[PDB]
């Protein structure tokens, strides 16, 4: 069958970049390398070499000119590759896709190759608030190609071509341990102790799939429980140089299931996170975008067992919270972590950084 | 007989802006209006309207891409004009320059007209620090032209044309009062009192013109004066919502002219501010630039006698300082204000704004 290839052309119409993919999957041990082809006419450059750069940047504000505290940009990773004149052979001779592209395009083609490091974060975007006149902070991947006499030379708008890519992850094949937790809250002198137990049916849930929590309450004490409230919390951990954690509730279920003293209780609730009733919340994490199209809630950022440093960008996590409401204090709660992901398809101490960290801590909270 | 007119074209070539001038002089009572001509092909925008905007913005950082605390943009004045279809007749029928341009270009020409308000600041630029990897804060004037269905529509890079203008002032014809000052510093009990007098020869100095200060010291007391140090200070006052004043010395002259006790002294010094020995100083105010041409030290900002509010942008001022150094304290000083200009040619409270104000206060000091 035919193979689709993505391409983009420079505004002057000479420089063109060919890419075999736009979404590069991370396998928690290796990242799919970025291999492409650069087409150029040697007479157009005369003595101007051709360079391609892969950049991932922590950003803020919109892409255009914002009348605000515009983009705080901090490049988490930078790579440079010289398309023409040709670079030495490594890494390896050109791959099968590169060979096919050069055969299709001829001798005007030139391959470029980038190996994304493993510890780089995924592409996520914080949801802008209704009060802001621009998009909020986020981390994204991007590819540029240009011709210049040297790397330090300033960029040219008419000649350079800019293309956006993404880094994505998919659900692991193996299952995880059952998420369950318990908590006790005894009263002044009675051996009777308030006891609740909550558990999930699985550890990994697909997007839009409901969550079942089997809340079990053993209140052998003399107090009365009024309500049980169940919530799903999204944790967006922003790490630039200090770990700032922000919590956003994305789903709540409440029923007036009062519990009599010295009696047990059992129920199996159902809850489902979705984006329909979450568009007004500032600081909600969403998956990265190639354009202004819609995206689901941000998938959890899984970290391999070899969690050496891994602290960059935005890290997303989810937790289900069960809480018992008791008259005159006595609140008791449990939390059940889980991971939310798509199934695998079949086919520096600079002052301005500290200023921006303070600004983000103030604004988001 | 012949005159020059300035021209810039859209990247697509179908939109062009004609301007009679690039520097618009302020007369302290009226500002030279921005009158120009927009050339467009009606079939090109078969249904889109043509708008031109004059904007002045407090900016920071470079113009394309800073990996830093990028531009805090704060527009001080915004104007909108619909070139095509034509607006009502006012302000006035087209002027002589507009009529001549329309005759030269034909029916494919459309005039636009902007009247700059009186209280807007001049174009100045703060000198970037030797450590920063980008230009510093400054205020500038700029003109845009584009075709769109509505004013709220997003910008179009391939269609819009962007042009830079400047606002300048020239030295007034009338002379000012002679700057002179005195100060006395008497000792514990003696009626004898240290007394110095310093004065200038004029109140307005042209760029590169030397300054003569007539220091006159009457030290009838019993202490000895060791040195006389003369300095020229540049005061860069930044007003966004709060007033911040920054002092930068630009010239110093020191001579070991000791003064004997109970005796007078008299000398006429010479000092000249220039940019040769000031390229490493951060926070030095310079005149606005069109692209990257060299500019002298920023001209003093003078305000009309009816200085009611006028507090936006960056305001520059100069002062000559005379200081006597005495053994074991006893420092005594005077300051002589003056204005520095070119001769006339003869042929809200948003959070991010407070954050940026704090950041600028930290950085400049």
């Amino acid at each position: 069958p035919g193979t689709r290839v993505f391409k983009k052309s420079s505004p002057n119409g000479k420089l063109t970049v060919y890419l075999g993919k736009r979404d590069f999957v991370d396998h928690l041990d290796k990242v799919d390398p970025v291999d492409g082809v650069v087409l150029v006419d040697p007479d157009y450059l005369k003595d101007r070499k051709v360079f391609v750069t892969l950049t991932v940047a922590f950003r803020y504000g919109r892409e255009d000119c914002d009348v605000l505290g515009l983009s705080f940009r901090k490049d988490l990773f930078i790579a440079n590759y010289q398309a023409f004149p040709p670079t030495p052979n490594p890494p390896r001779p050109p791959t099968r896709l590169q060979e096919r592209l050069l055969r299709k395009l001829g001798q005007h083609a030139h391959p470029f190759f980038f190996t994304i490091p493993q510890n780089l974060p995924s592409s996520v975007t914080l949801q802008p608030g209704p009060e802001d006149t621009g998009k909020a902070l986020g981390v994204d991947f991007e590819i540029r190609a240009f011709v210049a006499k040297s790397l330090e030379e300033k960029s040219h708008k008419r000649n350079s071509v800019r293309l956006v890519i993404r880094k994505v992850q998919f659900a692991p094949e193996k299952p995880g341990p059952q998420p369950s937790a318990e908590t006790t809250r005894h009263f002044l002198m009675s051996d009777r102790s308030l006891h609740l137990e909550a558990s999930l049916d699985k550890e990994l849930y697909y997007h839009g799939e409901p969550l079942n929590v089997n809340v079990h309450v053993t209140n052998n004490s003399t107090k009365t429980v009024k309500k049980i409230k169940v919530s799903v919390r999204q944790y967006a951990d922003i790490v630039l140089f200090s770990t700032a954690q922000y919590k956003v509730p994305v789903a709540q279920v409440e029923q007036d299931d009062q519990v009599s003293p010295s009696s047990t209780f059992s129920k199996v609730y159902t809850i489902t996170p979705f984006l329909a009733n979450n568009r007004e919340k500032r600081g909600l994490a969403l998956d990265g975008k190639l354009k202004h199209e819609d995206t689901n809630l941000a998938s959890s950022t899984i970290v391999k067992e070899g969690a050496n440093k891994e602290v960059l960008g935005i890290l997303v996590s989810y937790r289900v919270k069960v809480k018992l409401v008791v008259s005159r204090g006595g609140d008791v709660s449990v939390e059940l972590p889980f991971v939310l992901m798509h199934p695998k398809p079949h086919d520096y101490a600079t002052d301005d950084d500290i200023v921006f960290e303070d600004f983000a801590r103030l604004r988001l909270k | 007989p012949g005159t020059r007119v300035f021209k810039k074209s859209s990247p697509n070539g179908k939109l062009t802006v004609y301007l009679g001038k690039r520097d618009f002089v302020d007369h302290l009572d009226k500002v030279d209006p921005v009158d120009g001509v927009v050339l467009v092909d009606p079939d090109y925008l078969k249904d889109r309207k043509v708008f031109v905007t004059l904007t002045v913005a407090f900016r920071y950082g470079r113009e394309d891409c800073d990996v830093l605390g990028l531009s805090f943009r704060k527009d001080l004045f915004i104007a909108n004009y619909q070139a095509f279809p034509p607006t009502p007749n006012p302000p006035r029928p087209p002027t002589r320059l507009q009529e001549r341009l329309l005759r030269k270009l034909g029916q494919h020409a459309h005039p636009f007209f902007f009247t700059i308000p009186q209280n807007l600041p001049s174009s100045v630029t703060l000198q970037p620090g030797p450590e920063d990897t980008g230009k510093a804060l400054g205020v500038d004037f700029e003109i845009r032209a584009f075709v769109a269905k509505s004013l709220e529509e997003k910008s179009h890079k391939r269609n819009s044309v962007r042009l830079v203008i400047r606002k300048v002032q020239f030295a007034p014809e009338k002379p000012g009062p002679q700057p002179s000052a005195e100060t006395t510093r008497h000792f514990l009990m003696s009626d004898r009192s240290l007394h110095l007098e310093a004065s200038l020869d004029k109140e307005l100095y042209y760029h590169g013109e030397p300054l003569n200060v007539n220091v006159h010291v009457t030290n009838n007391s019993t202490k000895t004066v060791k040195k006389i140090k003369v300095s020229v200070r540049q005061y860069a006052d930044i007003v966004l919502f709060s007033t911040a004043q920054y002092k930068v010395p630009v010239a110093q002259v020191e001579q070991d002219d000791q003064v004997s006790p109970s005796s007078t002294f008299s000398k006429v010094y010479t000092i000249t501010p220039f940019l040769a020995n000031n390229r490493e100083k951060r926070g030095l105010a310079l005149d606005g630039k069109l692209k990257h041409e060299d500019t002298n030290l920023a001209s003093s900002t003078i305000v009309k006698e009816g200085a009611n509010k006028e507090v936006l942008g960056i305001l520059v001022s100069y002062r000559v300082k005379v200081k006597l150094v005495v053994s074991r304290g006893g420092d005594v000083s005077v300051e002589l204000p003056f204005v520095l200009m070119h001769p006339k040619p003869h042929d809200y409270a948003t959070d991010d704004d407070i954050v940026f104000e704090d950041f600028a206060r930290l950085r400049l000091k």
């Binding site: 035919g2 290839v5 391409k7 096919r100 293309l163 | -």
Partner: peptide, 13 residues
Amino acid sequence: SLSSCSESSILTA
């Protein structure tokens, strides 16, 4: 008009 955006091409064996 429209804006110079990304596009696709076909590749064969």
